[PDB]
Nucleic acid binder design. Sequence first.
DNA 1: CGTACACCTGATAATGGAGGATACC
DNA 2: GGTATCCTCCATTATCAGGTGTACG
Length: 294
Amino acid sequence: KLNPWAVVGFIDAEGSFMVRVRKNSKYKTGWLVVAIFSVTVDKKDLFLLESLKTFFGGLGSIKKSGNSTFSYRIESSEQLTKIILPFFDKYSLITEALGDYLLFKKVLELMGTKEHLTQRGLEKIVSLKASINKGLSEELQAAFPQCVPTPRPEINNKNIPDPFWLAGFVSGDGSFKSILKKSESIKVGFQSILVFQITQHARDVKLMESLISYLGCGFIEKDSRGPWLYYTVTNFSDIQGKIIPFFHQYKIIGSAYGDYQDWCKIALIMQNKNHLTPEGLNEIRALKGGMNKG
DNA sequence: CGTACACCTGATAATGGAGGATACC
DNA sequence: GGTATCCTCCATTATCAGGTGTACG
Ligand SMILES: [Mg+2]
Ligand SMILES: [Mg+2]
């Protein structure tokens, strides 16, 4: 029982829009063109993959991916055009994932009129694929030297469309951190810190910036090493006053919801000042130990 | 004593594929 | 045949995530 804007928020965090162009001499052009919508998570979130499937009309399938991950995927061109496109055309992505989605859609529209089974459409598809995710492989790059990449979508400053979007997004790219930090001055030897965090690539700077006014707190840290921003809340009265109540009403999805509850329990012990006693520190240690376990 | 932001860093849950088998027309 | 989808498998990595230092009241 997922809400539409939560699903969009989650796919803004974790979805993959893929176009594969595979060599095969049984096709008249020599290539097979396939579009895939894919969501891949640890098995701990297998129940959220099942909800997603049910949400998307029972379509697609859920399969072992890696050692301990499972993917939900839709690989039918037809089913993609019928269910996925009208969903995201109505409830639009707001990160740079939107750019990949829009180029993915164009490929699908070209597959819909069968233009992919022609030389000219295949070339267009290769140009579209060229600006999606990591771009052309060495194989396609060499087989398609003429194909100029299609300009990436310039979509400007997108607002958070609905608070449920933020719930979904934080479900994928948010962290509810409990830290126990050695302290020379705290009477129990340790500081208990709750940190709320959202991690994104720097190109979505405007979005990340808008979280501060949206949530009425936080600040953006930039990783000194690369293009990575961490929207961060460390002020405990903001945690209590703004973050916890937001997510109480707009609930996180997946097993991360259990983690948020645990984190909430730490805050309670902290609101009571019991984190500054050995017993309270130990409760927090137990809650924390329990986090991220399914 | 205690909090809060400034600053640091790495293991791995996702990123984003791959190719062979089977079904459809 | 030609075309479409299903299924199984995975190499590498961009983050999440798990910190520590220190100024300030
Ligand atoms: Mg993400
Ligand atoms: Mg994520």
